[PDB]
């Protein structure tokens, strides 16, 4: 019965939009001053909210209270636009409407005045999928459109559009959202939905989102389903945070110290716990990389892993860079060799044994 | 009801046109001497003014006063042509009328004599999109053009046209506008618009235009919107930074200078934009290869790298060849190792750090 | 007669081996009424992606109601099992890749279900669709109508567009372990009344490499060639299971750099007839065991007691770096064995390279 969070929590006002401050400010200034162009192009990654901003702009233009940067959201025009029923909001699916016949029909039916609103807003989605003939047909119409016609375009790959089309439009490029904004949005949504949550679960979800907020919402839905109505740290770790445990750091420290017995005991403990071997190698490689970055720049380590910060810094002060590079290369090559190894555990054990054998400080004793 | 600068500000006389001196002078001399060719073709890059010059020529041909190089702009014919309402002016959009049955209906109407004007001008834009049979019909018409009919053709890519049409037409190629001309035009437009501006903002806008004055006007509109009615240098810098796509060359420069902080900042900026990491490595490898080629011979670069030619040449002059070879080898190894790295961003960071500091040990025999 | 992999297909969540997390998540979602409109099951070969998708469809379109435990007896369940249920449309995504098919399918998303309550599009092998098909799918996947559900099953999730992945709820299946495969094989054989031995089942489970369909195929091979009996000898013959000390003798000869004996042993093995990949795997295992013994004297397991002494001798003579070098050489030889003029030629080339590696 419950509708998906991504669809439900769609920004219905410019105040609900997370980030993208530059584009929102530019649009608000344009609407307030009255300098309204007839061709807007929106570009960026996935889930940034190009379509949401286009819908908000369409609401702002066609509002019974006039052209305002802050649409009322209560007038019948705003309600119809929110419900996807407004007659003067022509939404085109360029992915399916690729053949030039559809473009010709649209351009032939572009002269008539709008029914109720003061503009006839054409919102073409996934415009990058149109053939060259459609672009060429749309060129002149974009050049000198009728006063009561506005074009809004959105795409993920603006590099494949014709250069003329790019020249004929106002470009707005949205950037991926940072971790803090995603975490704050998830916290607000969960508070509104009355669902228990923990800070580390939100941190893990935000880190796994990787900019796209829709990915964050999908992962939140998965976590809610797994936790049976609650978003717990264990629930999130079960599916996403199977990695990022102190075992990887302990193994790295043992390898640095050439403690073969400790490494073997840690491997046995991980095997008992049922730890994926490829994930373990990935975590070790990541830890080595972050130590190298710390050696390069002291500000490389953020608060994300602050819990281990101190320890990491210690490994940066003692281990020479060349040893870190040797360990990283050895683990990477072992990863290359893992698929063809007789067994995953055997492959990881052989990789660690090779790393210990060529230890720069104390190699294993040689036969005599 | 503010109007778009590109749409509002359009040339109305040959004096208003910025640059393109040779084409304007040739057309004026031809009109003055009465040498009017039966078919004209206009070629060039985007926003160079092909359509504007074609419309000005159409005004000049059918002006009431006479066949003058500079149309009066006050007589009824000039006003109707400017408004696109002239009886004998036909603006065929070949892009939306590539069908043969649509072009045939006009090539047949070519027969009738002009109602009002001396000539029945046929302005065909985006002519390169016509079909083969449409090209055949146009070839027939150009082979037998009535003395009272003229044809004006505009196309960004004349190569697509058959050689016969090119032979039966007089070609005019419009050069990309220079930075100074674009800057002066922007300054004049802003002064006439009563909008505050700064010289550095104008210079940055002209540089970002890349020879297309229409792009310059679009960027000016964006800057005005962002600056709240003022073209401030801060707004232009912010816009350019948001839409900057030269991050590969900046990364190469930072790697050459061995500045870790700048490399990290550029990597973060690229991550925010979402640029593919493997594509970034490929672009860096290509840039290094082209810099090496420039070092071998200055003729390596052409018009393709005109946007960043100066920086590439400077890097070629400064960097010794051996360092370039070492960086190329390091980046190639990094690209080879990228698939096995846990994160592509992590692999790129490792490769860049290795190039900055860690020198590969050349294998011994 | 239907093959075992086609006759013992799970019909309820109780019959699914492993994949506990996915089943628990689906049950919680169905119980709490938080059904999503897009599910993408990603996993290795033969881990029940299609079976799980079909069971989810049965649960969604059961007459009793939306439940995580479909009855399996109502008309909807029977028709879904038979495969002639109208409202369940199963696409191939490999025989129908062109944009026209996807576009016409997306034009039939408005009509209400004929009989059931949800219109279930089960797209299998979705990774074999062109870019245009994915782009056409995108917007419909984002905000489909209420009465429509999309189910996706792929074995290669990294070939899909990022947007498609972001628009779907991802469930990552895990490869089955040896014990689970062995238990399932034992249960199936007990139900089918077929003789078996623990060693045969253990060998089949180990050779399955985490795929249950492969295990069932190997079991069928054994049954066909084993005169209706899964015996240890038949399984060993089919899989070419090394039993004698050929691997140890070859390793010792390679370490001693005695090329003559190595070639003689290779010729003798070829005359007998042995699977080369199995021999290479055994040699790699022996090298790993020697390295482990060098790490700690107690690593040597009791299983290889008969040769323990000999093994220890190697641990006292071969430097660890040489052991690593030999292990990597054998691994590379195994990797390139398929891409050689002959398997025996590849083995000989690998062993000659190992012989030439003598650093002492």
């Amino acid at each position: 019965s419950y509708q998906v969070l991504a669809r439900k929590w769609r920004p219905q006002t410019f105040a609900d939009v997370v980030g993208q401050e530059h584009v929102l400010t530019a649009l608000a200034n344009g609407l307030s001053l009255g300098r309204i162009h007839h061709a807007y192009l929106f570009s960026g990654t996935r889930g940034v909210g190009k379509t949401s901003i286009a819908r908000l702009l369409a609401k702002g233009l066609n509002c019974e209270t006039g052209i305002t940067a802050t649409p009322c959201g209560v007038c019948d025009n705003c309600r119809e636009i929110e419900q996807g029923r407004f007659v003067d909001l022509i939404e085109i699916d360029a992915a399916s409407r690729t053949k030039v016949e559809d473009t010709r029909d649209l351009l032939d039916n572009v002269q008539y005045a709008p029914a109720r609103g003061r503009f006839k807003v054409y919102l073409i989605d996934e415009v990058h999928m149109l053939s060259r003939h459609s672009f060429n047909a749309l060129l002149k119409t974009l050049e000198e459109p009728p006063e009561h016609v506005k074009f809004l375009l959105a795409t993920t790959d603006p590099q494949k559009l014709p250069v003329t089309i790019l020249s004929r439009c106002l470009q707005f490029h949205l950037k991926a959202l940072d971790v803090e904004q995603i975490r704050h949005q998830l916290e607000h949504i969960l508070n509104e939905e009355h669902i228990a949550h923990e800070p580390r679960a939100l941190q893990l979800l935000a880190r796994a989102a990787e900019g796209s907020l829709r990915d964050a919402l999908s992962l939140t839905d998965q976590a809610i389903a797994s936790g049976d109505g609650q978003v717990s740290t264990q629930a999130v770790s079960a599916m996403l945070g199977t990695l990022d445990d102190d075992q990887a750091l302990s193994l790295v420290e043992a390898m640095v110290e050439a403690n073969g017995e400790r490494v073997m005991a840690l491997i046995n403990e991980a095997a008992a716990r049922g730890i994926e071997w490829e994930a373990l190698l990935v975590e070790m490689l990541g830890l080595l990389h972050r130590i190298a970055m710390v050696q390069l720049s002291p500000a490389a380590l953020g608060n994300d892993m602050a819990a281990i910060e101190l320890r990491m810094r210690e490994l940066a002060r003692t281990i020479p860079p060349t040893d870190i590079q040797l360990y990283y290369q050895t683990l990477l090559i072992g990863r290359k060799e893992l698929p063809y190894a007789p067994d995953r555990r055997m492959g990881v054990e052989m990789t660690l044994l090779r790393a210990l054998a060529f230890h720069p400080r104390m190699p294993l004793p040689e036969p005599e | 009801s503010y109007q778009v600068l590109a749409r509002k500000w359009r040339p109305q006389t040959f004096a208003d046109v910025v640059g393109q001196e040779h084409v304007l002078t040739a057309l004026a001399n031809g009109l003055s001497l009465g040498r009017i060719h039966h078919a004209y073709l206009f070629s060039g890059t985007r926003g160079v003014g092909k359509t504007s010059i074609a419309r000005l020529l159409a005004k000049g041909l059918n002006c009431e006063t006479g066949i003058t190089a500079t149309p009066c702009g006050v007589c009824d014919n000039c006003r109707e042509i400017e408004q696109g309402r002239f009886v004998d002016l036909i603006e065929i959009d070949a892009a939306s009328r590539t069908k043969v049955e649509d072009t045939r209906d006009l090539l047949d109407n070519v027969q009738y004599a002009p109602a009002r004007g001396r000539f029945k001008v046929y302005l065909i834009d985006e002519v390169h999109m016509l079909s083969r049979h449409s090209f055949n019909a146009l070839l027939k018409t150009l082979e037998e053009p009535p003395e009272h009919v003229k044809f004006l053709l505009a196309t960004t890519d004349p190569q697509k046209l058959p050689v016969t049409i090119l032979s039966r037409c007089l070609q005019f190629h419009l050069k990309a506008l220079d930075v100074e001309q674009i800057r002066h035009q922007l300054e004049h437009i802003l002064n006439e618009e009563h909008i505050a501006h700064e010289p550095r903002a104008l210079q940055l806008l002209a540089r970002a235009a890349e020879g297309s004055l229409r792009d310059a006007l679009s960027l000016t509109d964006q800057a005005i919107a962002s600056g709240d009615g003022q073209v401030s240098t801060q707004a232009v810098s912010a816009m350019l930074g948001t839409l900057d796509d030269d991050q590969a060359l900046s990364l190469v420069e930072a790697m050459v200078e061995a500045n870790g902080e700048r490399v990290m900042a550029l990597i973060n900026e690229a991550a925010a934009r979402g640029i593919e990491w493997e594509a970034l490595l490929v672009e860096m490898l290509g840039l290094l290869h082209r810099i090496a080629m420039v070092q071998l011979s200055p003729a390596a670069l052409g018009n393709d790298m005109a946007a960043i030619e100066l920086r590439m040449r400077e890097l070629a002059r400064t960097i010794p060849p051996t360092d370039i070879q070492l960086y190329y080898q390091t980046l190639l190894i990094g690209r080879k190792e990228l698939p096995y790295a846990p994160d592509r961003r992590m692999g790129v960071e490792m490769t860049l750090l290795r190039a900055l500091a860690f020198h590969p040990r050349m294998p011994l025999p | 007669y239907q093959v075992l992999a086609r006759k013992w297909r799970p019909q309820t969540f109780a019959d699914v081996v492993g994949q506990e997390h996915v089943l628990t998540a689906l049950a919680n979602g169905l119980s709490l009424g938080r059904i999503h409109h897009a599910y993408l099951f990603s996993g290795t070969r033969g881990v029940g992606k299609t079976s799980i998708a079909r069971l989810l469809a049965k649960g969604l379109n059961c007459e009793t109601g939306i439940t995580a435990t479909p009855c399996g007896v109502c008309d909807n369940c029977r028709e879904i099992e038979q495969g002639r249920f109208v409202d369940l449309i199963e696409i191939d995504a490999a025989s129908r890749t062109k944009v026209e098919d996807t576009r016409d399918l997306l034009d039939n998303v408005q009509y209400a279900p004929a009989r059931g309550r949800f219109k279930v599009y089960l797209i299998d092998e979705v990774h074999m669709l062109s870019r245009h098909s994915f782009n056409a799918l995108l917007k419909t996947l984002e905000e489909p109508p209420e009465h429509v559900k999309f189910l996706l099953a792929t074995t290669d999730p990294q070939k899909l567009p990022v947007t498609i992945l972001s628009r779907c709820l991802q469930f990552h299946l895990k490869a089955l372990d040896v014990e689970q495969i062995r238990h399932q094989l034992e249960h199936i054989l007990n139900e089918e009344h077929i003789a078996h031995e623990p060693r045969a089942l253990q060998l089949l489970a180990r050779a399955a490499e985490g795929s249950l369909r492969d295990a069932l195929s190997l079991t069928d091979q054994a049954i066909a060639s084993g005169d209706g009996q899964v015996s240890t000898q038949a399984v060993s013959a089919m899989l070419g299971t090394l039993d004698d000390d050929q691997a140890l003798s070859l390793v010792e000869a390679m370490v001693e750099a005695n090329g003559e004996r190595v070639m003689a042993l290779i010729n003798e093995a070829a005359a007998r007839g042995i699977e080369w990949e199995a021999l290479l795997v055994e040699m790699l295992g022996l090298l790993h065991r020697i390295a482990m013994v060098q790490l700690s004297p107690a690593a040597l397991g009791n299983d290889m007691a008969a040769i323990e002494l000999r093994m220890r001798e190697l641990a006292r003579t071969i430097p660890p770096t040489d052991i690593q070098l030999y292990y990597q050489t054998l691994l590379i030889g195994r990797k390139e064995l398929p891409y050689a003029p002959d398997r025996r030629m590849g083995v000989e080339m690998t062993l000659l390279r190992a012989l030439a590696f003598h650093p002492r």
Binding site: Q329, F358 | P360, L364 | -
Partner: peptide, 25 residues
Amino acid sequence: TSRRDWQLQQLGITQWSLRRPGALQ
């Protein structure tokens, strides 16, 4: 020249030596 370097090369493990100590901070 050392046998360890030869074995490392045979294993494919590339060994990297820093050339710009000042770059690190």
